[PDB]
Design a protein around this ligand. Structure first.
Ligand SMILES: CN(O)C(=O)C[C@@H](CCCCc1ccccc1)CP(=O)(O)O
Ligand SMILES: CN(O)C(=O)C[C@@H](CCCCc1ccccc1)CP(=O)(O)O
Ligand SMILES: [Ca+2]
Ligand SMILES: [Mn+2]
Ligand SMILES: [Mn+2]
Lengths: 410, 410
């Protein structure tokens, strides 16, 4: 039985995780949902508790802690450990009855819960790409100290890559470990992208696009931040750095390819030049499930891929003139040091400004570029705690710097 | 070092094997070619021996055994064991210095040499799909008795399938074994086909196509027999049965899909519905190489797949009305017993009649159908020697039946 905790259980990743766990458990009882952690949606947490009856419940917002305890009293024959805040999160991570943790939280609390999951030697299904891009150095250091901890990618493209590999070799290494690509015989990565809602706009059309325009995607419904990142292709920029860190693949060996049908989720070229790819309909249940079953697979009742009906798959190179964010991401990764931290942070601000109609499309890449230009590389701290603090400081500096550039151009 | 013997070294598969071995060895000294076995082409064998300097040479045709001994005297620091006929082949199979054997021989010397390779617990890279189709029961029994022997597929689609698997799981079983699909969590197979030269043709056009029409394949210059099979789609029919035997996949779980670009070589749907596929330009060097390196990969200098340049991949269902051979193959496979033997044998005759302009396109499937209609299941011999004779007898009977049908009609 797979004992799992879901962090951010009412968010998109969390709800998809619970959906596929429910459906798979109907086929065969494989999963015990041992813990649920949510921010403030106490009614939904209660509804989830009613169904999954986890040993642990944690709600981040203390102001509804008391409300949750009262709600849970309605549930027959059920006496969970009910917790609150950051320390409830640490307590869940320290439990011996939990093997795997799904991190479906963004920003700080994402990195924070990830850190604690690793320190407790857990298998960590990580869906927060920003944490890998921003804190890749720290995660690598932590995984070197906590040798039985493992990060398993949930981001769809990185799951695809992971699935294309031979588990016989994967089991001799782990994500974020030096030599991962060498041990797995990886030569090159094709990172497939939907291309976003602006993929066929002219330069003139791009100058004027608004977030309202973007918040209508050609394939999926998602959170606002990632939708904007998909529109600028900074999402794929972030995913390039994520690939580099997860799989130890050199930047000149990662190619972004636009695949508008979203059936092939990414491909791996091995040293013999054979290419393996993973395919399915656009659906996050597959990557989430695999992160929890790896290195095995279990049955689902998902709709089988009908290739003949899909009929046609297309691929083209993205225009770096139209999607300059892709270029900035490569430049920042190749530069190394903490440039990815700065890229991530400055993008956070620029994405939000465009979201809220404060700047235009090309101002996004302009602002990020100027912040990157501005940064000066730093000696990387050897101590893991100092390194974490250094990352946070650079992150905060870069957000402030972006904001100041905005305020200059008003 | 990988110690390999090439059986049929001057045929298509044999020459491709030596070419990729040569090229890979330039990059890293990986392979020792320990034995070469050819039928009659004593000059070419001499040329190969000069380059590869194998410990063993065998020529099947005894009449040129002496010419071979004399020719090799021209080679300076070289003292090979020179053999001939079946006994040389057997002596090679029994060598403890030989790990893997590429069987690039057709019909029955192919099967006979496979049998001896298996009896000597070798790894057998098998390219002869007709032997798996016709003698699958026999190979299965022989592999159950000789536990360390393994067949590794070389047929491009079956190699693709094999490459999509986790060797982690593969190493717990082996091809042509009961439960192979269960252990590897396989649900379903997409077997990709070029579709041959006639996919767009009407039924009325198909009535009158000729072998000269068929022998201009849209994608690959190959032997005449397989070219005709690709035209009728009997090639895929045979490969469906090959899939069933190699991977223990039920017939209802094998779908033939027409993929004219011949980039995706086949796909495996796992029990979670995730699909993994193998991709490359049409080239037989990758499947051959993988059969020799499995479960590892080695570097090549093959041209990298350029997906953006490829640009478009298409897929459609084959019409069983237009390609009735596909339907007959499934029917024979589903029927089981020795029906696949009968299918293969009658096709051998029908294919050749069509090739030589003695019958028309739909006469191929008509003759095959009538031979199958005429066969009745037989008790399967328990004894491996009796079983082999049963297969040969049925094969011979089916060829005679097909011939007598043609003769009646003519
Ligand atoms: C899903 N995923 O990993 C993402 O980063 C979101 C996609 C945009 C959604 C594409 C449609 C889709 C594919 C697979 C799974 C769910 C949705 C970003 P991109 O392809 O536009 O770069
Ligand atoms: C190669 N192979 O395994 C074959 O059975 C030959 C192909 C026809 C040639 C397609 C082009 C090709 C693909 C892969 C490797 C070499 C050539 C048969 P089919 O696709 O027409 O059924
Ligand atoms: Ca795999
Ligand atoms: Mn993604
Ligand atoms: Mn084939």
């Amino acid at each position: 039985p797979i004992n799992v905790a879901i962090f951010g259980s009412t968010g998109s990743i969390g709800t998809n995780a619970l959906n596929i766990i429910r459906e798979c458990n109907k086929i065969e009882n494989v999963f015990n949902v041992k813990a649920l952690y949510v921010n403030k949606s106490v009614n939904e947490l209660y509804e989830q508790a009613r169904e999954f009856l986890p040993e642990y419940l944690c709600i981040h917002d203390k102001s509804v802690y008391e409300e949750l305890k009262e709600l849970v009293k309605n549930i027959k024959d059920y006496k969970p450990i009910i917790l609150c805040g950051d320390e409830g999160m640490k307590e869940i991570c320290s439990s011996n009855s939990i093997d795997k943790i799904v991190i479906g939280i963004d920003s700080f609390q994402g990195l924070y819960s990830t850190m604690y999951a690793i320190m407790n030697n857990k298998i960590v299904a990580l869906a927060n790409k920003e944490s890998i891009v921003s804190a890749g150095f720290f995660l690598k250091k932590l995984l070197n100290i906590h040798k039985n901890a493992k990060i398993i990618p949930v981001d769809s493209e990185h799951s695809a890559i992971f699935q294309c590999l031979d588990n016989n070799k994967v089991l001799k290494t782990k994500c974020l470990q030096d030599n991962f690509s060498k041990i797995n015989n990886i030569n090159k990565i094709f990172l497939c992208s939907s291309g976003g809602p602006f993929q066929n706009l002219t330069m003139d059309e791009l100058k004027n696009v608004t977030s309202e325009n973007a918040l209508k995607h050609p394939k999926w419904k998602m959170g606002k931040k990632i939708t904007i990142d998909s529109a600028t292709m900074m999402n794929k920029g972030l995913e390039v750095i994520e690939t580099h860190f997860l799989f130890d693949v050199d930047y000149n060996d990662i190619e972004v390819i636009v695949h508008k049908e979203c059936i092939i989720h990414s491909c791996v070229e091995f040293i013999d030049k054979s290419v393996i790819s993973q395919m399915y309909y656009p659906d996050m249940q597959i990557p989430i499930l695999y992160s929890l079953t790896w290195p095995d697979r279990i049955k689902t009742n998902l709709k089988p891929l009908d290739l003949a009906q899909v009929s046609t798959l297309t691929f083209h190179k993205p225009s770096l003139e139209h999607f300059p964010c892709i270029k900035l991401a490569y430049q920042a990764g190749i530069k190394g040091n903490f440039y990815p931290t700065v890229l991530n942070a400055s993008n956070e601000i620029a994405n939000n400004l465009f979201l809220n109609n404060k700047i235009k499309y090309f101002d996004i890449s302009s602002i990020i570029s100027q912040v990157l230009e501005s940064f000066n590389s730093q000696k990387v701290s050897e101590n893991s705690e100092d390194l974490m603090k250094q990352i946070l400081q650079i992150h905060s500096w870069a957000k402030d710097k972006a904001t100041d550039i905005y305020n200059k151009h008003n």
